[PDB]
Design a protein around this ligand. Structure first.
Ligand SMILES: *[C@@H]1O[C@H](CO)[C@@H](O[C@@H]2O[C@H](CO)[C@@H](O[C@@H]3O[C@H](CO[C@H]4O[C@H](CO)[C@@H](O)[C@H](O[C@H]5O[C@H](CO)[C@@H](O)[C@H](O)[C@@H]5O[C@H]5O[C@H](CO)[C@@H](O)[C@H](O)[C@@H]5O)[C@@H]4O)[C@@H](O)[C@H](O)[C@@H]3O)[C@H](O)[C@H]2NC(C)=O)[C@H](O)[C@H]1NC(C)=O
Ligand SMILES: C[C@@H](c1ccc2ccc(O[C@H]3CC[C@@H](C(F)(F)F)CC3)c(C(F)(F)F)c2c1)N1[C@@H]2CC[C@H]1C[C@@H](C(=O)O)C2
Ligand SMILES: *[C@@H]1O[C@H](CO)[C@@H](O[C@@H]2O[C@H](CO)[C@@H](O)[C@H](O)[C@H]2NC(C)=O)[C@H](O)[C@H]1NC(C)=O
Ligand SMILES: [Zn+2]
Ligand SMILES: [Zn+2]
Ligand SMILES: [Zn+2]
Ligand SMILES: [Zn+2]
Ligand SMILES: [Zn+2]
Ligand SMILES: [Zn+2]
Ligand SMILES: [Zn+2]
Length: 776
């Protein structure tokens, strides 16, 4: 027919591409193009997967799944336990750890092979079960390189996280934004069940196997048809490692759907969680026993990685949109541990997203979801820049579900990736990995760079920070390089006259720039301005500081903005009026007010406070945002300075009007103060750095640093905070925790490079820039 039927004799699980002729590969069943003898020749199950005493030295029966004869080592098809049963050897788990300082690979191996062992729904807390349940896995964790947990990407669903690992891209970037999704361009829907998921048009970016392929590294067939058992896949990977030098792949992948399947049906803390965990460990033991049989246990690099965790979710904790909305039949909702709303039909003139958002906003005192326009989602989630992401998004609180209209499950996932239950596992074992080393938790977007390094691959452009995980590897082939500055700063003097201004208003480096001047990595003209208490880089294009740096010691006296100085704004004689803002625009804008990047409340002396009221320290701020900002400046900064023995703060604006996580150009800026060229930031950031050894002051730190950061949305109302009518001590801190950010996120949104002049390696700094303070 279209395929036909030849013989799979000597072709079982071939890697060669073969369609005119009949196939014998891992996915031949999936296309119904196998040969008549494929099942009988390749999918053998007779007598199981383990050797026994009776089978030692047996006469070779080809019917058996694996063999226990003397020849099986030469012919390459013993069972994984042949040597321990029939030759008195030991399981790999029973052997003590021995540090693999150099790869002990057979001749013909140019590089250590990489085997990626991925598991679905593996909570990091499962490793607390330890050697009791998973001895093989614990040995990999103990004698290898391991993190306490690895942060997944949002949403914490299976395929978005699996592909993020393969690409190093955020789901908005590689295109798999959920297990269920609708692409308006395709007019088609992607689902966990169906053929549309196999269409490659959905899968963007460059996955690892393509990156290896385009650079001459042989990738084994990673993906298996469902009907092939796990044990057969393990024996096949071992057989591939025994292939001749001109065919042996360098990178291998094993994926297991457990313990995710059981976790959904039993709950993450269920007593029969143990059985799937043991079964996974037994599969790992078969791999390690087999690698030891092939003398590859001290040659291969093994990665044990998960995609997400699992949380207690039952139908008794389900929110229904029908208790909020009157048009549930006019909408389409992606349900579950997350919510995405869409009109059921286009041309429905009775569909208003504004009315839907309002009717979902703080309508119940314990409302277990929060509506969001995707552009207002916390920037750490990086979930806006895709046509497959609906404008209306619902962030569901942990342990809860959202449906459209009113259990067989006790567990589910998909929540905010900072939720502790969604954290998953990472283990690195092999010659290139470190021995008995614990590394701090990291995000799964960084693994693509490491896997490329472990294969000598040049990474495709991705959202990992290359070099941020060099501390995982005994041998690092990537040396990070500081980006070069593009725009150098003007250091202007006192060059203008206060009479030359038509403002319309009325009325250091050793201490405040502790980690070096941020580098402007884009072409602009900006001025570095010095003051007693703060230093800034003032942009002449955007009429405000790009960054503002100041240090607050543990011993600091808070002050109030004086009543006479409340509305004081002063011209800066170092900046021209044409490159300055004006207070008339703020008066002529009914909705926009102004704030100050360096807080006047924290001025050192009454004379120094006059600098805090300079026009060059002024930024546009909604009255709603000013409530958040003023509490942060008047209360929170000193509190942080008291807890952390002083803090250095870098604050400034962020413009991202197309919600792509990147720095806006002037053309992409779409709002300005009324009758003015002053741009309105979409967000405001701050970077709060101190000495990790808090017995040292922030301005006199010797070793590693500690950082916390946020990116607050700049919004005209506080509808995000349901308790905003109360005092700021009751809601402001909670809002800031939800919008915590890595310094790296700020760098993308500002085009600035931080921590350039410090006393640690660039690799250590890159790890600091990727840190996310979770408060969880
Ligand atoms: C995380 O890292 C990624 C990758 O480094 C960054 O995304 C990149 O952003 C830059 C802009 O700063 C884009 O450059 C533009 O490229 C286009 C032409 O791009 C074409 O060619 C590239 C190279 O082959 C290809 O990757 C592009 O693929 C896009 O289209 C595919 C089909 O639709 C899609 O599968 C793929 O994911 C990508 O989609 C992009 O567009 C959609 C629509 O906006 C968006 O939803 C999605 O997230 C992607 O952004 C494309 O064929 C030029 O015309 C421009 O002038 C400009 O040079 C890169 O294209 C883009 N690369 C990728 C892989 O996304 C992220 O910014 C970064 N995030 C953060 C937060 O830092
Ligand atoms: C549905 C999808 C698929 C299936 C199983 C999957 C099981 C695991 C897995 O990911 C793990 C973590 C990452 C690692 C590494 F990539 F880093 F090595 C690999 C294991 C993925 C993913 F998402 F990554 F691709 C799967 C992807 N297939 C569609 C489109 C890609 C695929 C190919 C196939 C075809 O036509 O052949 C058609
Ligand atoms: C959003 O909520 C408002 C207020 O409840 C809804 O407006 C009401 O619609 C009902 C229809 O059942 C009518 O009684 C009135 O026209 C409205 N007022 C009151 C007091 O009920 C509105 O329909 C809701 N919109 C959506 C999309 O859910
Ligand atoms: Zn989904
Ligand atoms: Zn859908
Ligand atoms: Zn698979
Ligand atoms: Zn699942
Ligand atoms: Zn398994
Ligand atoms: Zn942008
Ligand atoms: Zn550090």
């Amino acid at each position: 027919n279209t395929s036909g039927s030849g013989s799979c004799k000597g072709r079982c699980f071939e890697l060669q591409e073969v369609p005119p002729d009949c196939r014998c590969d891992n996915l031949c069943k999936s296309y119904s193009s196998c040969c008549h003898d494929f099942d009988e020749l390749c999918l053998k199950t007779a007598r199981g997967w383990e050797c026994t005493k009776d089978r030692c030295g047996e006469v070779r029966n080809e019917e058996n799944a694996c063999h226990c004869s003397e020849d099986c080592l030469s012919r390459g098809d013993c069972c994984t336990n042949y040597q321990v049963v029939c030759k008195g050897e030991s399981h790999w788990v029973d052997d003590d750890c021995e540090e693999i300082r150099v790869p002990e690979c057979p001749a013909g191996f140019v590089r250590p092979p990489l085997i990626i062992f991925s598991v679905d729904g593996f909570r990091a807390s499962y490793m607390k079960k330890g050697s009791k349940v998973m001895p093989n896995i614990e040995k990999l964790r103990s004698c290898g390189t391991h993190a306490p947990y690895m942060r997944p990407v949002y949403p914490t669903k299976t395929f978005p996280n699996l592909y993020t690992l393969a690409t190093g891209l955020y789901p908005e970037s590689h295109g798999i934004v959920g297990n269920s999704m609708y692409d308006p361009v395709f007019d088609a829907t992607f689902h966990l069940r169906g053929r549309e998921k196999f269409n490659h048009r959905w899968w963007g970016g460059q996955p690892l196997w393509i990156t290896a392929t385009k650079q001459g590294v042989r990738a084994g067939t990673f993906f298996w048809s469902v009907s092939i058992p796990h044990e057969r896949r393990i024996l096949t990977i071992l057989q591939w490692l025994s292939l001749p030098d001109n065919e042996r792949p360098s990178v291998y992948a094993f994926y297991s759907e457990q313990p995710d399947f059981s976790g959904h049906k039993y709950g993450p803390f269920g007593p029969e969680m143990t059985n799937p965990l043991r079964e996974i460990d037994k599969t790992v033991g078969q791999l390690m026993d087999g690698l030891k049989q092939l003398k590859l246990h001290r040659c291969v690099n093994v990665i044990f990685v998960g995609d997400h965790g699992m949380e207690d979710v039952t139908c008794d904790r389900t929110e229904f949109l029908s208790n909020y909305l009157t048009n549930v039949d006019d909408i389409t909702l992606v349900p579950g541990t997350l919510g995405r709303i869409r009109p059921k039909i286009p041309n429905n003139l009775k569909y208003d997203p504004k009315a839907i958002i309002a009717n979902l906003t703080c309508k119940k005192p314990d409302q277990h979801f929060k509506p969001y326009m995707k552009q207002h989602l916390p920037k750490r989630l990086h979930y806006a820049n895709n046509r497959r992401i609906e404008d209306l998004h619902l962030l569901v609180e942990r342990r809860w579900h959202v449906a459209r209209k009113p259990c067989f499950f006790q567990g589910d996932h998909g929540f905010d990736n900072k939720v502790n239950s969604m954290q998953t596992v990472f283990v690195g074992y092999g010659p290139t990995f470190k021995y008995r080393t614990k590394v701090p938790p990291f995000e799964n977007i960084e693994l693509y760079n490491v896997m490329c390094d472990l294969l000598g691959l040049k990474p495709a452009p991705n959202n990992g920070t290359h070099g941020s995980l060099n501390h995982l590897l005994r041998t690092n082939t990537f040396r990070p390089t500081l980006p070069e500055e593009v725009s150098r700063p003007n250091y202007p003097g006192i060059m203008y006259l206060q009479s030359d201004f038509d403002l319309g208003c009325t009325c250091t480096e050793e201490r405040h720039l502790l980690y070096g001047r941020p580098a402007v990595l884009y072409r602009t003209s900006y001025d570095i301005l010095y003051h007693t208490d703060f230093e800034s880089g003032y942009s002449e294009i955007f009429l405000m500081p790009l960054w503002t740096s100041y240090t607050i010691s543990k011993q600091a006296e808070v002050s109030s903005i004086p009543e006479h100085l409340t509305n004081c704004v002063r011209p800066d004689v170092r900046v021209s009026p044409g490159f300055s803002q004006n207070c008339l625009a703020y008066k002529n804008d009914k909705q926009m007010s102004y704030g100050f990047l360096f807080p006047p409340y924290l001025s050192s002396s009454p004379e120094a406070k006059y600098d805090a009221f300079l026009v060059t320290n002024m930024v546009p701020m909604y009255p709603a945002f000013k409530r958040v900002w003023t509490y942060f400046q008047r209360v929170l900064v000193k509190k942080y300075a008291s807890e952390r023995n002083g803090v250095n703060v870098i604050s400034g604006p962020i413009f991202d009007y197309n919600y792509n996580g990147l720095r806006d150009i002037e053309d992409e800026i779409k709002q300005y103060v009324e009758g003015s060229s002053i741009p309105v930031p979409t967000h405001y950031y701050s970077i709060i750095t101190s000495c990790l050894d808090f017995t040292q002051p922030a301005d006199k730190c010797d070793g590693p640093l500690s950082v916390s950061s946020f990116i607050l949305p700049h919004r005209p109302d506080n509808d995000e905070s349901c308790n905003s009518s109360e005092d700021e001590s009751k809601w402001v801190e909670e809002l800031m925790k939800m919008h915590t950010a890595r310094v790296r996120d700020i760098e993308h949104l500002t085009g600035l490079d931080f921590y350039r002049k410090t006393s640690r390696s660039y690799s250590e700094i890159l790890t600091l820039k990727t840190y996310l303070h979770t408060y969880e």
